[PDB]
């Protein structure tokens, strides 16, 4: 019993570093999300933009292939 | 040494609740990766297909529809 506090001093000490060590990983995982949460904001736009003016070329390029295609019927038939 | 022995006994019992109390937030917010980002990876692949086909569809729509059309409108000759 006399030493039984000595053993129970270390659990009062060891549990302290398990508090100390663990919160450090909680520190890291926050910016392991936030910085990535800035990366998956630019990637969508930089990827969606390179589509939003791809339909504007899939169409206007056919404008020459429809506004001028009305002329062939005048002579082909 | 009764009050000193008892003090450490109730002392440890709270820091071992923090042991769960700090691995409670960790278990939850760590699951905020395993599904939120993993599906967020899929939508990139889903949006990825459309950039494979608008090129394939326009592959015939830009070349073939102009290899012969402007050939057909060679009436200037």
């Amino acid at each position: 019993l006399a030493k039984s506090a000595v053993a129970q001093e270390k659990a009062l000490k060891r549990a302290e570093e398990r508090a100390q060590q663990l919160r450090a990983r909680l520190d890291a995982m926050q910016e392991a999300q936030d910085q990535v949460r800035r990366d998956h904001e630019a990637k969508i736009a930089e990827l969606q933009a390179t589509i939003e003016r791809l339909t504007s070329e899939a169409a206007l390029a056919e404008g020459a292939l429809e506004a001028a295609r009305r002329d062939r019927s005048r002579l082909q038939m | 040494l009764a009050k000193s022995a008892v003090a450490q006994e109730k002392a440890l019992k709270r820091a071992e609740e923090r042991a769960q109390q700090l691995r409670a937030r960790l278990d939850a917010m760590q699951e905020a990766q395993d599904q939120v980002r993993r599906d967020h990876e899929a939508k990139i692949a889903e949006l990825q297909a459309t950039i494979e086909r608008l090129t394939s569809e326009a592959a015939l729509a830009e070349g073939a529809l102009e290899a012969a059309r402007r050939d057909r409108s060679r009436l200037q000759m």
Epitope: E46, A49, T50, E52, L54 | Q48, I51, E52, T55
Partner: nanobody, 99 residues
Framework: DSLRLSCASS????????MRWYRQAPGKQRGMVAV???????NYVDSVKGRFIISRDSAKDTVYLQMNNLKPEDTAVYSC?????????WGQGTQVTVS
């Protein structure tokens, strides 16, 4: 007898979204030849099949568009292309004449 169309880079080492090539025959406007996308997917127009080959090299950011089996029709004027920020960008290209 065996040629290549290599379009180099200046910035943005594989900041590569859709990026492509164009050719044109004199007295006419422009047209594409082959287009590749950053996902290894490659497709070709009908003509440049079996003779002209496009491939990627991200380690240098220099799209490889090999000119093989140069048939007489392959005479043309060429120029590579890319698209970043939305605003398209262009360059020179050169004149390929094989008969």
């Amino acid at each position: 007898d065996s040629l290549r169309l290599s379009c180099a880079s200046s910035r943005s080492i594989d900041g590569i979204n859709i990026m492509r090539w164009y050719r044109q025959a004199p007295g006419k406007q422009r047209g594409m030849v082959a287009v590749v996308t950053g996902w290894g997917s490659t497709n070709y127009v009908d003509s440049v099949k079996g003779r002209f080959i496009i491939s990627r090299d991200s380690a240098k950011d220099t799209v490889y568009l090999q000119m093989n089996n140069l048939k007489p029709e392959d005479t043309a004027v060429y120029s590579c292309n890319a698209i970043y920020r939305g605003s398209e960008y262009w360059g020179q290209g050169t004149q390929v004449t094989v008969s």
